[PDB]
Design an enzyme around this catalytic site. Structure first.
Site, PDB file in Angstrom:
ATOM      1  N   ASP A  67      10.590  28.903 -15.047  1.00 47.89           N
ATOM      2  CA  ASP A  67       9.332  28.791 -14.352  1.00 47.89           C
ATOM      3  C   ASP A  67       8.606  30.142 -14.305  1.00 47.89           C
ATOM      4  OD1 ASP A  67       9.472  26.033 -13.854  1.00 47.89           O
ATOM      5  OD2 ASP A  67      10.765  26.288 -12.127  1.00 47.89           O
ATOM      6  N   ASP A  83      13.807  30.192 -11.522  1.00 46.84           N
ATOM      7  CA  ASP A  83      13.603  28.767 -11.701  1.00 46.84           C
ATOM      8  C   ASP A  83      13.559  28.087 -10.339  1.00 46.84           C
ATOM      9  OD1 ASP A  83      13.292  26.918 -14.000  1.00 46.84           O
ATOM     10  OD2 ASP A  83      15.055  25.920 -13.193  1.00 46.84           O
ATOM     11  N   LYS A  85      13.781  24.909  -7.908  1.00 41.22           N
ATOM     12  CA  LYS A  85      14.444  23.604  -7.914  1.00 41.22           C
ATOM     13  C   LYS A  85      14.425  23.106  -6.477  1.00 41.22           C
ATOM     14  CE  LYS A  85      16.869  23.879 -12.112  1.00 41.22           C
ATOM     15  NZ  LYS A  85      15.953  23.151 -13.087  1.00 41.22           N
TER      16      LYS A  85
END
Ligand SMILES: [Ca+2]
Ligand SMILES: [Ca+2]
Lengths: 228, 230
Positions: A67, A83, A85
């Site tokens: 990301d 990232d 999540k």
DNA sequence: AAAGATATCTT
DNA sequence: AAAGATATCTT
């Protein structure tokens, strides 16, 4: 440090707003939230990176991890991947990316070569589960479709598990512990080297794994046997 | 319902843009570059309209529970047996859509569908087509930067825009026609009927190999049918 | 589990 | 193409 501040910074969406001031409430799909959380971390990831002299980059091309890529132009091979999540508490678990892409092919599906990142952070958001519009004046009446967001930042190898998180989309699964376990870092791998070796050699279907390894113990025994 | 449904979507879209998410404390966050987000943002936008028009016609509308098609189910309680499935889609600029799997409900009446497949008499795709392109406040809203431009929308039967090639591999999806937005609104598809759609996708093989001997397109399917499916 | 749905992009 | 990435969820 960059990491401490970020964690410090990271410690309720009403809906999508249209340019006419009307507000559409969120839906029940668990899909909407994962993205919502990225949008929420974005400013923070950026103010902190900048404060530390990192440049942030999001994937431009599709189907690419991570990301956010943070790095200094001075230190090109000390890139950091972040990232976002999220999952709902109902002990929680996460899918943590493919085991057949970049970790097996250094340049496959990643914005920058895998050997260029020296850290892989996961910012995990954990939360608890009207079809009409509202105006800013009545924000207080808009139904939230989730409560108690809790987040943690943690290295990926640390919370990684030994069971795949998905089947046809060959995903690494995380440990299946409590939020405190992800925060505290209670994992199963001795090191990142092990984390990687385990997943670089993991087979797709049980049928192929039964003759090799299907959990961390069997893998360690597999190493003893001579990776034969 | 159908004519009313689209008129609403056509008018509202040609006069409204999404600027970003908004928090309980008025802080507005701008949208992202994630293509996959838009398919849901357009769904949220569409919900009010759908509910409204459906309400005029005496339809009750329902959404599912995880991994269940479709996004919206409409049926009259006095006529439960005649459901209308509405699946929102979205994509960027010729356009292609993935229209769901060809191994779930189309092959097994109750697998991954909110109601038995045989309870629906229409499956409509409302497709959103766009072109890809700080923490704000309401009084700034108008000047928040959007990640898309020129959104268009059509409402079309699924079997109509459905194609004869896979829209995905590992996830076994039906792919639509690779055409221009106009072919979607006009319905310039490849199947002659809905049953030719169902049959073609129910006997389609998961791999080129398996298909190599069966049929890999609409012509081959039709030749295959001529011989007696041999 | 472990396999395969949900959905969309890509060479 | 066709097959396999990005994700997350449930049988
Ligand atoms: Ca939906
Ligand atoms: Ca949809």
């Amino acid at each position: 440090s960059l990491r401490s501040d970020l964690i410090n910074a990271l410690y309720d969406v009403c809906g999508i707003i249209s340019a006419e001031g009307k507000i559409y409430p969120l839906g029940s799909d668990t899909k909407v939230l994962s993205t919502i959380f990225e949008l929420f971390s974005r400013p923070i990831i950026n103010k902190i990176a900048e404060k530390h002299g990192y440049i942030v980059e999001e994937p431009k091309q599709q189907n690419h991890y991570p990301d956010f890529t943070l790095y200094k132009p001075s230190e090109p091979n000390k890139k950091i991947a972040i990232d976002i999540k999220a999952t709902y508490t109902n002990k929680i678990k996460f899918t943590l990316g493919g085991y057949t892409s970049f970790i097996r092919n250094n340049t496959k599906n990643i914005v920058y070569p895998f050997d260029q990142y020296i850290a892989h952070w996961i910012i995990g958001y954990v939360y608890t589960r009207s079809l009409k519009t509202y105006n800013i004046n009545e924000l207080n009446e808009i139904p939230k479709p989730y409560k108690g967001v809790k987040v943690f930042l943690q290295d990926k190898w640390v919370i990684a598990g030994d069971l795949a998180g998905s089947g046809n989309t060959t995903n690494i699964g995380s440990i299946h512990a409590h939020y405190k376990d992800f925060v505290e870092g209670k994992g199963i791998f001795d090191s990142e080297d092990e984390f990687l070796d385990y997943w670089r050699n993991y087979e797709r279907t049980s049928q192929l794994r039964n003759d090799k390894y299907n959990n961390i113990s069997e893998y360690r025994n597999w190493i003893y046997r001579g990776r034969k």
